[PDB]
């Protein structure tokens, strides 16, 4: 989901 | 200064329009090339409120000429006063609105009205100090209607802190082209709500009925409709165009007539009622020309003034007659019926005098009410609208624009939420 | 979605 | 002046060119014996019309022409005809035996006893020229003389002429019309010896304007003079920017220039619009923007093939009569955004417009309207290989089976000339391939 | 009034989404919401449109758009030339956008409007995908980034 | 004195060229046999600018005629001043250029070159202080472009003291003759970079849309598009030709104009636009012919003035006006889009006036700028130039005349570093 997502990029971070 | 813009759209608005262009420019003494004629200073004193000035001392009127179809504009051009008006005024569609609201505000009107605003931008801009805008346009058809209140809210965008008069043509089924008329009618009557600061009601039922059983015209025209409408608009507008003791502008009166900013609807009426080419030989006497203007059968509005209370009156009276007989007549109106006037607004009856008559008339008499009788107008198209709705009659028209039954049921219940605060404030 | 599938590729890319 | 010479070879290029100098005498006023009674100027007028004609000291207009055939029969009809008195005597070169459909005998056997005749009566019209452009050659690919002596008698004005422009029109066979089995060969080995030393070919698919007379003349069996009629309406567009005062291809190195990118492909597909019925005369007349839409419809065009399977290179849109220059653009306009028209990449997708306002003449009790105005769009596309594949296909069958050969063979051609030929044929197709 | 709805929330999903990717202005973050355009809110529209233009092409933007919008002039300005930049995209990219009509920009509100502006927005992020494909789940992803 | 030597150059620079003799012959009241018949002194006192005096009070033209075919001047000859020319001044080829600029520049226009030189020399020697040259040309024909540039690289060799000023016509996909005009303007934008102090962007595209869109013509025709150039060559030269508060110069305009060497393309514009044989009934005010000029609907250069800057601006106002009045709306122009001026020049516009107004007009304003905007008109020549170039389309009518590649491939870079160069004074 867009919500997996915009979690997974706070962890690349 | 102080400038008016003027604007007439659709079918109509243009010929009412066209009338009121006619009559006031002979008021002034303009003829059909733009050129002055007249014998009286005080005829140019305040011409700059309709005209500007053109090369050569020519008046040109600062009207805006707006519809969806060439053919009612042709026939302007084509008339006795067609080539006084800017040509790059004119500003038409080829599609036409078919006297649906929804083809005049959301899709035929919505193409055409950013052209119309660039004219609206170029004469106020040419203005030293622009008072505000003047829409004539009916209620009951398409462009008109619905390209004339999206006109007025995108003006109100553009110059929101300028004043919005409108002559509303207000449709009846005793007048009636289509039978969609009462959705047309509700549906703009919500936008003049919010969007208008003076709305003069002008009841196409009042005018057949002062045609046909006062005027004793057997078969009345628009033709003749447009006369009396013609001379109500001069009436009006006369403490704007002549010098008098009001220096009045359209936020003056707006002021003094407007006391709540919904209840802004007027009844307009005149005094001696005449029909196009008759002549009366005998003028009126003051007192003749009061009991006249404020009797319901010379109300331009099909309501009875004894079925609400006044709220605030303007009276304006045309030609060289006694100041002070003007005064003691309306006071007797006042302190003879002074029940039909709200006594929590004192002085609520004010009265201009002008030297200069209407044409025809050695005097004349100009009534504005605001009455809380004009829910009586609504209150008919409500019933008339509702009839249909409930069956959802011909709203396919409206939906095969892109219109919801919603914003139905939100222009009726507006328009209801409109005639129960008159009701409030006539109790 | 091809908003999911954008969002994939950007986060492949990012990885 | 910039004076051109016109070569009528063999049958075919003879009744085109008999076809065209009626028409462009009625174009320019002049009468069959050459007399011009309009021309008040004893002296230099309209000095345009002088690249196709000469004065003669006795006020008589002789066309700039050279008609051959090696048959007689052609030629006496020119001889005894409505223009007899047009063209001089040394003008008309006959022989006595033909090539009988065969380009070996037009090359190798009798065109080589007429070729020094023919080079000495153009290179005396050549003399009288002051500014000699080039040379417009009129001949067929099928017939043996149109084929085999058109490709000597180019490679020859090649060598005396060099720098001179070499303009052809030649007629593409076409099986309802044609009178020989051998007419592809005939077309390759022609094509091939003509391709070096041509600058620019309209091609005229004979198959193309039977069908425009059918359907367009109402004309149930049209004639070659049906379809000559129509072919000298078309050249006549064509030559029309060096006959008279105009603004666009007022010289032949302008045709090579504005047409052919590439030296190889020189073939443009020309189109005409209106073609009407003088039945119809009377009939509303077509606007700038139908006339132009008229000439991207395949129905229209002068070679059978579909330029929607191909790209445009070149485009020119040549009118006549009443035009201007307003309506043509707003036709264009609406053209480009309602037709499919790719061009190459490399090339600006440009239309060059020509207007002459020298409305179109009709050759009177001829089967064409009188119209008001006339184009001609000359377009250099890829589709035109269309027409060189169904050549070659034709070519191969017989050819993998060595038919006819003999006959080719035994006025002393190598078999081997076949196999150059349509080799240098298939690396013409791929060129065309390769821009497309 | 249900697929409004529906479609509404998938249009805000999607701008969700680009965010992700592409921040949103400050100005357009306040004004993102799933019900953004079930009513006529003009004011979303031109920062919505500015949002997306930007990430098309920020210089054909730059070219054909003046901006911030001060004026109504300019905003009148900025309508206008909405509609014919998406004219002109739709023929460019061959969309099929039926009834590119003023009244997309007058009125920007409805379901009309609202399928509208998916298709635009899913347009712009098939552009973002082809270029993103040239360049080159998600718990799994994180869990080997960490 | 103050002589000009003009020259015109292949077909539409003969017919330009002849258009703006016809209409400066009328505003010097010079007829086509070379007579004066005026009736203001103001019409002689700088006569000799453009003008021989000849035996018998007679003006002739200090025009040089050029083509490499003899069609167009014969046009000329038999036109209605066709017999005010030297006949001397006539020079003429016999082959033509064909549309291309290597014929113009390398072959053709380089046999005929020392005899047009011969002319302009023997024009020069009659002049008492010679201040420049002005050519009209077009950029996408073989002659005007290639035999053109040719003459301004020679004409700068001889006299490079010298101003050479040109009127450039740039080719048009939608006024096109032929395919390779991209080839035969980018090798002549090249030229004139280097070779000219001023040259003036005439757009076929803008002539075209100003005709169509805004003149109403169906149908425009060379013949209109060349009354619009005619006027604004008019204009632009009406400084030099008549006494005002600036007594101008060709140096002075450059030095004025011209802030870098390179950057010397001006988009001219016109105000009120006409169409030929339309009589305009009404004259404009100083704000409409201010709001019209600087309006890109009236720019001859199809470039959007707000996708740059001005880094200079000339405005040339004719006939009878308020010079207040002028200043004040330059001013309001100016304070109001000020962004659109570069600020490191400062007071970069400026403003003359001339009595006399043009024929058929009471008042008309020329505009001159030199915008960034111009890389537009470049960038769109650029586009279509490698388009064709990529695949060396073409390219055989030029190599077959002995030119390179290489001569291409310097012609685009140079284009490209002007686009690049104007792109950093934006910035």
Redesign the interface.
């Given at each position: 989901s867009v919500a997996d997502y915009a979690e997974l990029f706070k962890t690349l971070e | 200064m102080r400038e008016i813009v003027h604007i007439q759209a659709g079918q109509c608005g243009n010929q009412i329009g066209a009338k009121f262009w006619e009559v006031i420019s002979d008021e002034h003494g303009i003829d059909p090339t733009g050129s002055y004629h007249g014998d009286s200073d005080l005829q140019l004193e305040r011409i700059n409120v309709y005209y500007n000035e053109?090369?050569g001392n020519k008046y040109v009127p600062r009207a805006i000429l707006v519809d969806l179809e060439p053919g009612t504009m042709d026939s302007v051009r084509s008339g006795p006063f067609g080539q006084i008006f800017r040509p790059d005024n004119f500003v038409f569609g080829q599609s036409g609105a078919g006297n649906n609201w929804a083809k005049g505000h959301?899709?035929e009107g919505?193409?055409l009205?950013?052209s119309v605003?660039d004219v609206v931008?170029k004469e106020s801009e040419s203005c030293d100090c622009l008072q505000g805008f003047q829409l004539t346009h009916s209620l009951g058809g398409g462009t008109g209607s619905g390209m004339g209140t999206?006109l007025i809210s995108k003006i109100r965008?553009?110059y929101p802190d300028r004043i919005m008069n409108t002559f509303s043509v207000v449709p009846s089924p005793k007048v009636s082209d289509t039978v969609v008329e009462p959705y047309n009618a509700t549906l703009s009557v919500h936008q003049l709500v919010e969007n208008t600061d003076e709305t003069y009601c002008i009841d196409n039922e009042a005018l057949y009925d002062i045609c046909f059983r006062t005027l004793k015209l057997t078969t009345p025209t628009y033709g003749d409709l447009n006369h009396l409408v013609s001379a109500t608009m001069s009436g009006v507008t006369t403490c704007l165009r002549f010098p008098g003791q009001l220096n009045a502008d359209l936020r003056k009166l707006a002021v003094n007539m407007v006391p709540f900013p919904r209840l802004h609807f007027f009844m307009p009426g005149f005094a001696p009622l005449t029909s196009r080419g008759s002549q009366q030989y005998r003028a009126l006497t003051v007192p003749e020309l009061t009991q006249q203007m404020f009797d319901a059968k010379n109300m331009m509005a099909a309501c009875d003034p004894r079925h609400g209370r006044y709220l605030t009156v303007a009276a304006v009276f045309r030609g060289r007659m006694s100041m002070k007989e003007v005064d003691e007549q309306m006071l007797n109106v006042q302190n003879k019926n002074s029940s039909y006037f709200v006594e929590w607004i004192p002085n609520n009856v004010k009265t201009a005098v002008c030297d200069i008559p209407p044409r025809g008339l050695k005097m004349s008499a100009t009534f504005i009410g605001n009455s809380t009788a004009i829910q009586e107008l609504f209150k008919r198209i409500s019933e008339q609208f509702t009839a249909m709705f409930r069956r959802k009659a011909f709203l396919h028209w409206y939906t095969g624009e892109?219109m919801?039954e919603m914003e139905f049921t939100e222009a009726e219940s507006n328009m209801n939420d409109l005639v129960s605060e008159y009701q409030q404030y006539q109790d | 979605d091809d908003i999911q599938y954008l969002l994939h590729l950007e986060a492949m890319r990012r990885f | 002046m910039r004076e051109c010479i016109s070569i009528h070879v063999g049958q075919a290029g003879v009744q085109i060119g008999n076809a065209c100098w009626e028409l462009y005498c009625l174009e320019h006023g002049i009468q069959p014996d050459g007399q011009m009674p309009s021309d008040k100027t004893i002296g230099g007028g309209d000095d345009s019309f002088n690249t196709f004609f000469s004065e003669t000291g006795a006020g008589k207009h002789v066309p700039r022409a050279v008609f051959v055939d090696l048959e007689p029969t052609v030629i006496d009809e020119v001889r005894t005809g409505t223009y007899r008195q047009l063209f001089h005597p040394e003008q008309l070169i006959t022989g006595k035996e033909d090539a009988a459909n065969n380009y070996a005998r037009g090359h190798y056997t009798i065109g080589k006893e007429i070729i020094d005749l023919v080079l000495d009566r153009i290179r005396k019209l050549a003399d009288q020229c002051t500014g000699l452009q080039g040379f417009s050659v009129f001949h067929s690919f099928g017939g043996g003389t149109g084929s085999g002596f058109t490709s000597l008698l180019m490679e020859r004005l090649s060598v005396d002429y060099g720098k001179k422009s070499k303009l052809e029109f030649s007629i593409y066979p076409a099986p309802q019309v044609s009178t020989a089995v051998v007419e592809p060969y005939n077309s390759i080995l022609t094509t091939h010896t003509t391709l070096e030393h041509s600058d620019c070919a309209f091609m005229v698919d004979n198959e193309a304007i039977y069908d425009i007379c059918r359907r367009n003349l109402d004309i149930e069996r049209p004639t070659y003079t049906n379809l000559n009629r129509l072919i000298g309406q078309i050249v006549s567009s064509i030559t029309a920017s060096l006959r008279f005062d105009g603004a666009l291809n007022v010289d032949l190195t302008e045709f090579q220039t504005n047409l052919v990118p590439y030296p190889r492909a020189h073939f443009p597909l020309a189109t005409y619009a209106p073609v009407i019925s003088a039945e119809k005369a009377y009939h509303e007349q077509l606007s700038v923007a139908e006339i132009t839409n008229a000439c991207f419809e395949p129905a229209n065009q002068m070679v059978k093939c579909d330029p929607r399977h191909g790209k445009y290179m070149a485009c020119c849109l040549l009118y006549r009569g009443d035009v201007v220059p307003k309506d043509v653009n707003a036709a264009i306009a609406t053209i480009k955004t309602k037709r499919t028209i790719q061009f190459v990449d490399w090339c600006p997708t440009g239309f060059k417009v020509g207007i002459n306002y020298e409305p179109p003449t009709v050759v009177p009790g001829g089967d064409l309207a009188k119209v008001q105005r006339a184009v001609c769009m000359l377009s250099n596309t890829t589709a035109i290989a269309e027409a060189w594949a169904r050549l070659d296909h034709k070519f191969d069958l017989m050819y993998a089976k060595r038919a006819f050969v003999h006959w080719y063979v035994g006025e002393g051609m190598e078999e081997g000339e076949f196999s150059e030929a349509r080799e240098d044929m298939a690396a013409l197709e791929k060129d065309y391939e390769e821009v497309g | 009034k249900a697929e409004e709805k529906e479609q509404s929330e998938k249009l805000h999903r999607k701008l969700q989404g680009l965010a992700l990717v592409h921040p949103l202005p400050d100005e357009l973050r306040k004004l993102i919401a799933w019900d953004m355009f079930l009513k006529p809110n003009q004011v979303a529209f031109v920062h919505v449109m500015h949002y997306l233009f930007r990430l098309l092409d920020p210089a054909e933007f730059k070219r054909r758009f003046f901006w911030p919008i001060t004026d109504?002039?300019s905003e009148?300005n900025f309508?206008?030339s909405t509609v014919e930049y998406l004219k002109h995209l739709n023929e460019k990219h061959q969309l099929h956008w039926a009834n590119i009509?003023?009244?997309l920009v007058?009125?920007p509100g409805?379901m009309?409007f609202i399928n509208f502006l998916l298709e635009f927005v899913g347009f712009v992020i098939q552009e973002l995908i082809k270029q993103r494909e040239k360049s080159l789940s998600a718990k799994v992803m994180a869990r080997q980034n960490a």
């Open positions: - | 053109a090369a959301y899709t919505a193409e009205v950013d605003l931008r999206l965008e553009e892109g919801d | - | - | 109504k002039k009148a309508r206008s009509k003023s009244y007058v009125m409805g009309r």
